[PDB]
Amino acid sequence: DVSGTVCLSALPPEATDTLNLIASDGPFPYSQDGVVFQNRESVLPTQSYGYYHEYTVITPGARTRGTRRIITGEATQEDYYTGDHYATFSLIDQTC
Amino acid sequence: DVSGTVCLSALPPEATDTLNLIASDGPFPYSQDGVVFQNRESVLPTQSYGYYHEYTVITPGARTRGTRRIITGEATQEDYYTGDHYATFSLIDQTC
Numbered sequence: 001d002v003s004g005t006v007c008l009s010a011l012p013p014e015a016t017d018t019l020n021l022i023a024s025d026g027p028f029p030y031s032q033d034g035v036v037f038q039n040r041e042s043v044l045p046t047q048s049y050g051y052y053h054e055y056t057v058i059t060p061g062a063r064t065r066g067t068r069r070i071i072t073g074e075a076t077q078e079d080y081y082t083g084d085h086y087a088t089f090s091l092i093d094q095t096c
Numbered sequence: 097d098v099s100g101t102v103c104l105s106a107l108p109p110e111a112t113d114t115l116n117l118i119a120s121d122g123p124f125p126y127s128q129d130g131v132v133f134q135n136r137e138s139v140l141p142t143q144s145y146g147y148y149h150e151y152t153v154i155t156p157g158a159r160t161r162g163t164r165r166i167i168t169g170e171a172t173q174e175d176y177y178t179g180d181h182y183a184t185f186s187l188i189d190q191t192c
Contacts (some may be wrong), residue, residue, distance in 0.1 A: 041156045042110075046125040 103192035
């Protein structure tokens, strides 16, 4: 399940950067950006394969990709944030 | 024959999710949710066609709809669990 909705303004500023890159279709900093998210554990709503894609939200100072991501769904405004490597998700509200 | 009664708290958590959806009549995750269960091998009591319906119990980690299902009958609380693709069934006790 999804934890609830969070305003974009209440998430780390790097989440705003990632959403801006998704709207322009890149370029993305990481090679993994844009790959399909399988939702193997069924935390998000069940959908067809390819419905979900994953993008990095940079963690300042990290050497690796870290634990923060945005998962897009195919529906309008359907974007989920995770700050714990896919354990929990919140829907992002871009209007606040 | 129904193989016994099982407490709802003993089943995987997704069985509770499915029973909640059945109570609200969905919307369901799969298009096959809510089809008639034919009871072809007569494991459950014999009834007219249409008496039983089947619903998916999601299995996290599976690549398919998996083997877990809830079958409803028309009587109150008549809900059966199968974890083995219709081989065996237990009546669910929602009070424990």
